[PDB]
Ligand binder design. Sequence first.
Ligand SMILES: Cc1ncc(C[n+]2csc(CCOP(=O)(O)OP(=O)(O)O)c2C)c(N)n1
Ligand SMILES: Cc1ncc(C[n+]2csc(CCOP(=O)(O)OP(=O)(O)O)c2C)c(N)n1
Ligand SMILES: [K+]
Ligand SMILES: [K+]
Ligand SMILES: [Mn+2]
Ligand SMILES: [Mn+2]
Lengths: 362, 363, 329, 329
Amino acid sequence: MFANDATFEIKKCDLHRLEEGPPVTTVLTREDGLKYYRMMQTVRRMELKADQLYKQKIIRGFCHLCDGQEACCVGLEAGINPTDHLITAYRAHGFTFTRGLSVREILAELTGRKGGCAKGKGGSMHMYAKNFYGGNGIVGAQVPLGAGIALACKYNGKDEVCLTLYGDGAANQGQIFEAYNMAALWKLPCIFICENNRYGMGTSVERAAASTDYYKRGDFIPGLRVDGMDILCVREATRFAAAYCRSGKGPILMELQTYRYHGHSMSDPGVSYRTREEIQEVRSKSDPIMLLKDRMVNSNLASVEELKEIDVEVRKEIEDAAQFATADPEPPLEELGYHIYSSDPPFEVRGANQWIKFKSVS
Amino acid sequence: HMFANDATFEIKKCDLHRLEEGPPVTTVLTREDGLKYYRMMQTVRRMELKADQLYKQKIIRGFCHLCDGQEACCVGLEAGINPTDHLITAYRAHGFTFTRGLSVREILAELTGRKGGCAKGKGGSMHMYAKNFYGGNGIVGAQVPLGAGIALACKYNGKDEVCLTLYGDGAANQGQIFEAYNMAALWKLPCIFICENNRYGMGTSVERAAASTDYYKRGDFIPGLRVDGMDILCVREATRFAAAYCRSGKGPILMELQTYRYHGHSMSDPGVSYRTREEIQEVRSKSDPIMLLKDRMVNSNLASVEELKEIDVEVRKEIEDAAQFATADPEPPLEELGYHIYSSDPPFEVRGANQWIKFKSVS
Amino acid sequence: LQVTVRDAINQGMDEELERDEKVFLLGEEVAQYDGAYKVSRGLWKKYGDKRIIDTPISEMGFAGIAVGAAMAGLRPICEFMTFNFSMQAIDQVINSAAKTYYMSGGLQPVPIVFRGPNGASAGVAAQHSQCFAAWYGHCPGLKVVSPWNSEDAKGLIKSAIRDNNPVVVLENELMYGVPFEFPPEAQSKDFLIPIGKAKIERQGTHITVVSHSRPVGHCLEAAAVLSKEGVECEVINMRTIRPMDMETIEASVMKTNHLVTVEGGWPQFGVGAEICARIMEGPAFNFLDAPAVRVTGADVPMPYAKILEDNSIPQVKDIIFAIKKTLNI
Amino acid sequence: LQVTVRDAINQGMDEELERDEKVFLLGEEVAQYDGAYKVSRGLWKKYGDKRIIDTPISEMGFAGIAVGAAMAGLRPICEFMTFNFSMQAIDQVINSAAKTYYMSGGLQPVPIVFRGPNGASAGVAAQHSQCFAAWYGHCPGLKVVSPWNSEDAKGLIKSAIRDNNPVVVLENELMYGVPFEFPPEAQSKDFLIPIGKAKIERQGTHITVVSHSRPVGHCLEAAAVLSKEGVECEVINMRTIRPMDMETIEASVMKTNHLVTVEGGWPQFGVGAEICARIMEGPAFNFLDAPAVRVTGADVPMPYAKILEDNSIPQVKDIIFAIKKTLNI
Ligand SMILES: Cc1ncc(C[n+]2csc(CCOP(=O)(O)OP(=O)(O)O)c2C)c(N)n1
Ligand SMILES: Cc1ncc(C[n+]2csc(CCOP(=O)(O)OP(=O)(O)O)c2C)c(N)n1
Ligand SMILES: [K+]
Ligand SMILES: [K+]
Ligand SMILES: [Mn+2]
Ligand SMILES: [Mn+2]
């Protein structure tokens, strides 16, 4: 006999121009808990597998991993509807899964095979899904795009919101400040989210930002700072920020304090600008998955043995996906020119000299 | 009749952002300084009104953005800084070109596109330069990072010089300005970011364009002050305070100058679709910067009505001469079309409208 | 009747706004100010705040917002006051809009239109005179058009709006007040000009003269002068920069044996360069009786002074000169 | 002595920093990270915070800061992590830097260098693979260069730094780790390569093959294969995109009678487009016994998948094929 649910304390958010923030208590059901645990573990194991495949040279170019930040993608999804919108930068494999793509499609995209979610056209940085707009490789560029998606939610009148994510490094891009001003001016249902993992590539927050209170950089935009290692903190803050945008009050900034265990990308060992001890300590004391596991077990929502059975099932899902991604064929060369334009008749695309022609179909 | 050597005046207290103490709320004006600021502002006003008349007669063409109503800003800013300090602004720069040291003749001859202009007719209204004056910039917001880099050079060279970096209320919503704020603060650049707020960005009022219209606070982590930009003494004092702040090594500061432009955005904008003629007339009658100084000087016995009238005559005659010059001066010769593409290079040829047309380019 | 270029663009936008509630216009001074060059006059009064949106001076930001809205299914028209100011926003045009359908494997279309005046005007100097036709034309995933007359501008703005992909419409400020005969077909709300197709504005036997935007009218003047001398120019109005209609230009050259390109932009890596290289790689090369040559703006930042600016843009006499060089006359 | 391209650039910068205290380097990760591709390795430890300056991710801002510092008399090297990211800043490069000396009538020079890797890499997909050679080449007031090997990179970075005008130095990320024999003249601190002069990398008599950056090495591989079959290619390394050395190409084609251009960029309005257009307008046209043709990247946003990427960039076999077509062999 497990508990059907339990009540948990969550850290109080720091507030900027808000007289009240998210609650400091929440109820988690056994059912929701097993779900979040499974999703976070699936993301973690997917990322570890990508690291493997990269080292085996089955993935190339960019591979930015989100391990350590699983309370963010899973917590954010836990606080919004399937009909809400989300856009992020290139560290997107987790959000690609939480917004509903399979591990198979994600890994086959990384391995550059036709079974990929973009048929091997996009690679790590450019994956899309229903109400998930990438997967954006130019730092900060996705922020005005998110505000525009929020503009469309308001135009269409269906009470949908858009979560618009950028990292700490991105936070110093001028277009983000341009977007804050217009979102405030037009009361756009845009939730600006700074995923603060302490480093923008190799540059710590203290060395890039004159002020490292990201949740206050919106200035006239209200903000909250949230513990992004705690899936329940993230979920509560997200529910609060979405209710805020749905009520017509306009945009809000949420800073998620989180941490990446890997380097900036597969090419960055991740240790010239921080210590291995720093990383180990974060992981040892505030890993998002161990934090939930402890909560569930100690409140009788689930057993050590249950969670271990989920781990075994996730491992088989990740192994199956990896086998598919490594055996699936590359896309056929004849499709090189496909999908340049939407809704157009076929045309020809010039290859490497004038005698090479590729058919382009929409 | 003996005149006072100096008098003390009350200046409006600045609103402050992240500063415990701001500029003084009184200041001493000497007769000599009064006379000089009065002549400077009148020179800028008469030059601008001449530009209007020249533009209507088609002697000036393309862009011409006038700064009348705002003379307390160029002149008061000049009064608060050294000749060896630096300044950069946008396109509404005729007054700054003058306060920074170019003649009315060179300015107007550049507007009329003649060889005697400060760029020999290459630049026109928006692009005039002088020593320690970096334009004169026609892309909105673009001069803000330039001004921050000029401050970085001041810091790098170690001469205790500062840079005044001016942008309008419309420009204040440009992303690169926020990028500049962050680097200036991070590096403690001696950059005074100055927002010249005349209430409109072309045809868009501040309330329609900016979610927050507190321009002095947009720097967020950067301190700022808001200053009466119709009061030349208010501007001078704020400026002295901001420059002292940057020279002390404390890093950047924002100053918002609340001012007003009597003309439209440019010669092509009547300036009446987005504001009333009464609003303009009431700003003029209540706050004209020249009228304000004239009344201070007369009421405090620093100058006579007849002395100031004589400066007006002298200035209007100067602008008539300058306009005669700019209107008679020949255009630049065609043969110099290609000149000054590259600095310090040997001569070369530039293609014209077809391959048989070749212009010599020399540095 | 006669309709000016500015009014034909206004007509096109008004019709498409009425036809589809998802279409909207944003940019600086589009709404209450009636447009920086009055091209959007009356639209805000007719459609309101929701549809005709005055923006702050935040090009990267509002271009990005427009691209996001298009991704979410809206159909924005994003006005740059001039294309000079598009440089601030050019990453959004190229990396967020142009490349997205391809990167996504055909999952995410981007139905956005960027429009605004492009190129030289009168005495606006070097930061405000630049032509971006070859820059935008270079880029896969974009369509790029450059209207000349009232018919061109209306039909191409309507086609751009109906297109499902990013379309750059390079207008011309000096053309805006020019009136043209506006035939019945053009006055209709169903009037569309296909993107990708040039139009022959004058039939000729002696030489093919190819241009885009304002200089098309200078080519016709040049041909009117030359015709009195027995020289018949075939004048081609490109209409589209990408994908350009090389077949039309080829068929003309095979007839006339001679080619001059005319454009207002800078010469090197310009529009004429691409036409010239295509004509040499293609089936028409052997039909040339002389080298193809290019008439362009002078290779300088645009000077202010009248006599300097006059000599920095192609004049009728420079087009005539190039043509007579080509014909050896 | 073999020196990799990355180390030769490093030597260039190091030598110019020591020589002139006004020289400084700024950009993302240039200082404490030793460079995003290790090109600036060891410079911060040698020169310190004041001279080697890590920036936030604020392209338009730090490029404008660099341009401003240059106007004031300093000699900045502004690194873009890649040139894809220069799009955010390209207004500063064009409107604030390139045009300013001309606008100011020769009063205000801008001695700035913009440098970093350009064009395609391995598997980095469409937002990260763009070549900007033709875009920057098009603009008066700029100089644009594009080194291939280690001598190229050292001599051109040093010329760029000593130039008093904006110079855009388009490097190549795949060349960084390639070692080259390094002549003793290139080891000198006085080693400079003149901007505006192409270099003949291989003499030949049958065909002129012109290229820039990485593909120059593929043209040389192509000529090695071809000369086993008795075909002698003259291979020309442009070095400079603007102002390009047309005189060297013309004199080569006047000897060989045939021309192929090879570039990694998109074909339309590309670098090959200008070379072909110039050859047709110029004195060598009558020397051509076949049309000049262009080998280029494929006309697509860059795909990720290896086989698609392989076929979106010129391969040696594509070069050999265009040469054989040109020679009718
Ligand atoms: C405009 C731009 N400049 C530089 C880069 C290269 N780059 C990719 S990610 C990155 C660091 C961004 O860090 P942060 O925003 O903190 O995101 P994180 O990966 O830590 O989530 C940089 C510099 C880029 N892609 N776009
Ligand atoms: C990036 C850019 N966008 C648009 C323009 C067109 N434009 C020139 S001035 C101006 C309004 C600027 O207003 P503000 O900053 O308030 O300056 P003011 O003239 O009132 O001092 C605009 C929209 C431009 N020159 N550059
Ligand atoms: K469309
Ligand atoms: K230099
Ligand atoms: Mn980060
Ligand atoms: Mn203003």
